[PDB]
Write a protein that binds this DNA or RNA. Sequence first.
RNA 1: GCCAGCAGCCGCGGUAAUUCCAGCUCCAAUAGCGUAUAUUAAAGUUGUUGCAGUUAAAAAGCUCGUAGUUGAACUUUGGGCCCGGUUGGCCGGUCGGAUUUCCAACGGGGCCUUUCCUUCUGGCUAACCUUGAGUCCUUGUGGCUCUUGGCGAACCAGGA
RNA 2: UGGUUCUAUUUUGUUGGUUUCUAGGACCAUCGUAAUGAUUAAUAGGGACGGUCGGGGGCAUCAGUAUUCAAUUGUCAGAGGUGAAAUUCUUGGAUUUAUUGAAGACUAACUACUGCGAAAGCAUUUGCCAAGGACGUUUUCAUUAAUCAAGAACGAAAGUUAGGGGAUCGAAGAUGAUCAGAUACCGUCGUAGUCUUAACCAUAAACUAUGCCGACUAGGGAUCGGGUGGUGUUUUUUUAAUGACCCACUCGGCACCUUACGAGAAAUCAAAGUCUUUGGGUUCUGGGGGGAGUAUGGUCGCAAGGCUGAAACUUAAAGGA
Lengths: 129, 81, 150, 142
Amino acid sequence: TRSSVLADALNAINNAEKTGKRQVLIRPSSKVIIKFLQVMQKHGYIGEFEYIDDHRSGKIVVQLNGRLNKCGVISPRFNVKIGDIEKWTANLLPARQFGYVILTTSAGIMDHEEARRKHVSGKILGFVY
Amino acid sequence: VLVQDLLHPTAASEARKHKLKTLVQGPRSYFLDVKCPGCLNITTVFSHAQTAVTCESCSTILCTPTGGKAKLSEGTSFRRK
Amino acid sequence: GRMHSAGKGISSSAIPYSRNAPAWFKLSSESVIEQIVKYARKGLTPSQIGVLLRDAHGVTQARVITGNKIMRILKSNGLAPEIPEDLYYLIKKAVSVRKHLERNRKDKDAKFRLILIESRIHRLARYYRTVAVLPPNWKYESATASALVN
Amino acid sequence: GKGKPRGLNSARKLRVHRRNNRWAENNYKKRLLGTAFKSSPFGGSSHAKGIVLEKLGIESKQPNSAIRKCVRVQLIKNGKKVTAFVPNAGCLNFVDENDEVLLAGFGRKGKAKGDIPGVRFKVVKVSGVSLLALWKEKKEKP
RNA sequence: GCCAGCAGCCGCGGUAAUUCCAGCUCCAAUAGCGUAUAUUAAAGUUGUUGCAGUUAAAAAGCUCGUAGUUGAACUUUGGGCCCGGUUGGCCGGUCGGAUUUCCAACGGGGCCUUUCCUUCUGGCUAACCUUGAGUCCUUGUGGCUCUUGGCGAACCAGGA
RNA sequence: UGGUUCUAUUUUGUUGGUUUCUAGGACCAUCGUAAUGAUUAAUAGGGACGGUCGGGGGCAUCAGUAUUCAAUUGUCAGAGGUGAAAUUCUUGGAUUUAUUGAAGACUAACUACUGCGAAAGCAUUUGCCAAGGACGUUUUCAUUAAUCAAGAACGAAAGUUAGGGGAUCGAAGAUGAUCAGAUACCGUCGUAGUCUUAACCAUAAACUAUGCCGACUAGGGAUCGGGUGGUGUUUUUUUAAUGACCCACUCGGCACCUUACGAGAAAUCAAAGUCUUUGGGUUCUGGGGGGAGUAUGGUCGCAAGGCUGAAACUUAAAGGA
């Protein structure tokens, strides 16, 4: 089916952006996703993005920059311990600096560098660069 | 096209595009207040019948069901709504 | 894409957004209640009720006009039927097929299709297990359908 | 969605569908029946004692001609009957019939070396004193 | 002169053989060399690190499945004050190391910003919200002697 | 806050047993304390709904037409057949023609870089029967999903078991040809089989000789299926309406071109790319060439046979581009 949501829309967003679409439309709207973008956005990777409701599981427009390089969903959703992310960054982030791996705790549908300032960890859904 | 407002496009592009994509979905079918000539009565019929409905009781006939839209008889004002 | 063939059909209804009223319709809610409950004993099935309601009188769905969903209502009134209606057409199909298999044991297409169909049923019968709407144990039995309806 | 189950509860079906696979890979074949103990000469070894029979002559495989020097043995164990191969010179001479010889592999496993056919061993010692010496003349024989 | 013979493999030898037998001559190890066997590295030709599977040897005929194996994200972040370590500079303070102001790095305990610290009965207090007195000296948040109201986790020891 | 219920340290000598004093358990109702308490809803899933789509399946009808045969209908020499032949039919007038008939077999052209199915595989027509993909969706449930040793459906044809069918082809068998031979190629007949019901077998170059999930890289122009928009093309009927059409857009296909930034032994590859800068998830397989997918055991089958699968021995190449 559609067996999983976040995935489906994400992939189309790394298949809009590749071609230089300035944007996207994506179907099944969640909370999950709303939250996901709200992380991405804070970090300078998209803008605006103009929910639309239709009383349904609902559609979401995401205006572009042409920055996005790449935002795969991970995906069992594994478990993770604090000191373990130190394995991930370098197995899927080009650098270190930068470019956020990203995970789901309790607060928080929130990356790892903010995670230090909180000292928390659970399961790791997508990742950006 | 490298870009476009898909929010609101043309009115065009909807009329033609398929019911289930105008973004927010909405039906095409719609209802249709019928004076058989004899009576003044006014029966609320649907554009896609499936049933022919009788008019009110006069026992009259109205509108045959086909693929999609009734074919209504001769008499019938069929003002829409 | 229909669970049995190579077929990816698309076609339902594009309930319209408005939750409340048609407005252009100005008759009463009570009004259609009466009407359904009028209809039922006569010889109904909820599936059909709406069709008949739609094509003739005000309605648009029961749904807007009341705060229920046909059935719910028949069930309050006690007209639900011993069966969940969609089922009582499948089993039927059973009898109506099996019978045809037995005038012409030299027919495969039909055979298969029967099974296929035994299965629609078990799965749909497993669900109207689960959720308290078939007295537990119910199991479907090929041969017991002909004095269950006629 | 490549061919493998992936979500979370897909421990069970994995520790099986490698443990099946491993099979075929030849190596993990030797190590479970492991062959090594039943089949082959040395069984679960590296070296052994044997005592010679004839001094057989085996010509070449062919891009070659080369009439080499081999000896049948009697081991001092399964008894197989083996042949084996000699280095250096004539080397043959220094293996005077029904003498004690110390055998080892041929660094190839199983398999079968260079230009020799069904042949799979070398003569390291004799009497236990080298060959290496009883050809660079650091000892001699009883 | 394709016969003897050598040659781990490629291969020499069928009348001038840089390979055989042997002379001289040189090369390598050298009180130690060779020889055969087994194992290792060589072997990323068993492989988790590190393989190959379009045709080289290999993707099951295709799908469902109980195990096995993996499994989207989200549940205190930030900021606020402290106080101290010991690397690194700037004085060496001096007959090659002792430490202070100047001062970077960097950890780390407090505590507070709505902030569990399983928590009660004592004994425990160890710390200052204390301050009964005050002042050596750079015309003072640079320096610690003292009992009285009041700090509990610096901790004994029974429990819930 | 009762009650209820357990106790069983502690004093009215004390040792033990009623049982009253105080203190710790624990509970159902009970007035009171609370911001009283339920994560998004993954371009993950499953489902419902709506127009749909398709040569996806089965059961039944329906039509084309050829072939063969036979009748009827005519005329009158060879016809057939071939590289060239001959066997073969020829007053018992074939071969041709006319029209009707009968039977089983198949579904032309359309018909393509196109359709749908898990693959095998599926095309005359219509009616039931239930299935399904793709979209559309301010429906729903909420991590249920990925691959899968075990196990279990389907599996071209051939072939088998017993009935039906037995036109045409046509191993086997017979033949005449060719040929040094010809048990083959060429020709004419021909059981069996091809077809179907019901039951077996489970192999294939079952072929993209390319496991699936995913996620990301670089341009295009086609097409099938949807959907959206354009006072868009005709339809003309009076304007619309739809419908075909055009174009714009998209999601999902089935492919194709062009590059090579990459990869490769190369031939070539938008995947065989993101791999010594070596690691997203997991199931199968191979490790020189033969011996040999044999001998053996074990097992499924009535049998054909399948799946499982050695070793001794031999060998310096066998192979790819």
